[PDB]
Design a protein around this ligand. Structure first.
Ligand code: NAG
Length: 332
């Protein structure tokens, strides 16, 4: 009858975050899955740390969690060839020609809200290649559910074995111990970070780079690197929107966990009340952990793209400096 975390009644494809921490690398996270696996991970430690006599069960729990991690990562690796095929296409869209020869002032008018015909051809491939990856993840859904259910069944079995000296006044040492050893470190790590300042700095990058794009678009327009910038800028906007979503959660859950933990330690509860509060803390930690994990990787992706974006603008420094209504080689 207890409120246990269930598998989403949502349409999977809408809850996937794509990460690109460095060049030549792409990965994905099915958000509900990560939250679900993390939820039951906390439920498992809370169940074995309740009684001072079951602390020794941690190695078995650690082994099982590591197994689930391997098994889950094995299913997601079934989409590797197809994911690698997407990476090759992104490589083409982001690097249409080499911009590394500083002793080369070459204007690529020869190639051919996008305009460039050759970029538009590479873009349609990207749309198909991306759509295929989502279909591959959607096609392996049941295999992902099977693993999620095995983690659910394990956590729930441990939780059913939780027992008190007197059901009228159950102890909360498990909640205290687990927090202190598994959660508290993460809370302090978040609290040492200025997440809102990170958002301000990203907002400025996006708005300032948009002005540089507006300038280039007016002078060049049809140039392949203009579409490349339009492509990187749009990706950076989605990335930022995701960081903003996760930051809101991180900030909320930091306050809630700190407040809720104070209401739960160094006191007793009737068994029923104890179990409901373990399920509720597990929910707060899973949501907080999922978002800090994603935020960190999305932050890395944003700056990986920004570094390239900055290199393209530096490559087009001559046109950026050029006078209003003055234009470089016009193309057709
Ligand atoms: C599960 O996730 C990753 C898999 O690479 C790993 O770094 C992490 O330590 C694993 N968690 C546990 C508790 O084994």
């Amino acid at each position: 009858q207890y409120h246990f975390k269930e598998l989403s009644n949502y349409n999977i494809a809408n809850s996937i975050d794509i990460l690109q921490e460095k060049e030549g690398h792409l990965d994905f996270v099915i958000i509900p899955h990560y939250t679900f696996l993390d939820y039951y991970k906390h439920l498992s430690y809370n169940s074995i740390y309740h009684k001072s006599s079951t602390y020794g069960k941690c190695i078995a729990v650690d082994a099982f969690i590591k197994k689930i991690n391997e098994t889950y990562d094995k299913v997601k690796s079934k989409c590797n060839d197809i994911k690698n095929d997407l990476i090759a296409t992104i490589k083409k869209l982001e690097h249409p020609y080499d911009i590394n020869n500083k002793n080369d002032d070459s204007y690529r008018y020869d190639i051919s809200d996008l305009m460039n015909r050759t970029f538009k051809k590479m873009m349609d491939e990207y749309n198909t290649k991306k759509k295929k990856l989502i279909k591959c993840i959607k096609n392996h859904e049941n295999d992902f559910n099977k693993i999620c259910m095995d983690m659910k069944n394990y956590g729930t079995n441990l939780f059913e074995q939780l027992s008190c000296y007197n059901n009228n006044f159950c102890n909360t040492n498990g909640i205290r111990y687990h927090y202190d050893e598994y959660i508290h470190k993460l809370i302090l790590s978040v609290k040492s970070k200025n997440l809102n300042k990170d958002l301000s700095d990203m907002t400025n990058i996006l708005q300032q780079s948009e002005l540089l794009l507006t300038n280039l678009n007016k002078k060049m327009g049809s140039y392949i690197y203009i579409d490349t910038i339009k492509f990187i800028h749009k990706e950076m906007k989605h990335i930022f929107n995701r960081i903003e979503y996760h930051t809101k959660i991180i900030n909320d859950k930091t306050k809630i966990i700190q407040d809720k933990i104070k209401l739960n330690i160094w006191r007793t509860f009737q068994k029923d009340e104890l179990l409901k509060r373990i399920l509720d803390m597990s929910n707060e930690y899973s949501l907080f952990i999922t978002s800090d994990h994603l935020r960190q990787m999305l932050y890395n992706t944003f700056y990986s793209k920004e570094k390239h974006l900055n290199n393209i603008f530096h490559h087009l420094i001559y046109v950026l400096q050029m006078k209003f209504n003055d234009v470089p080689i016009k193309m057709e």
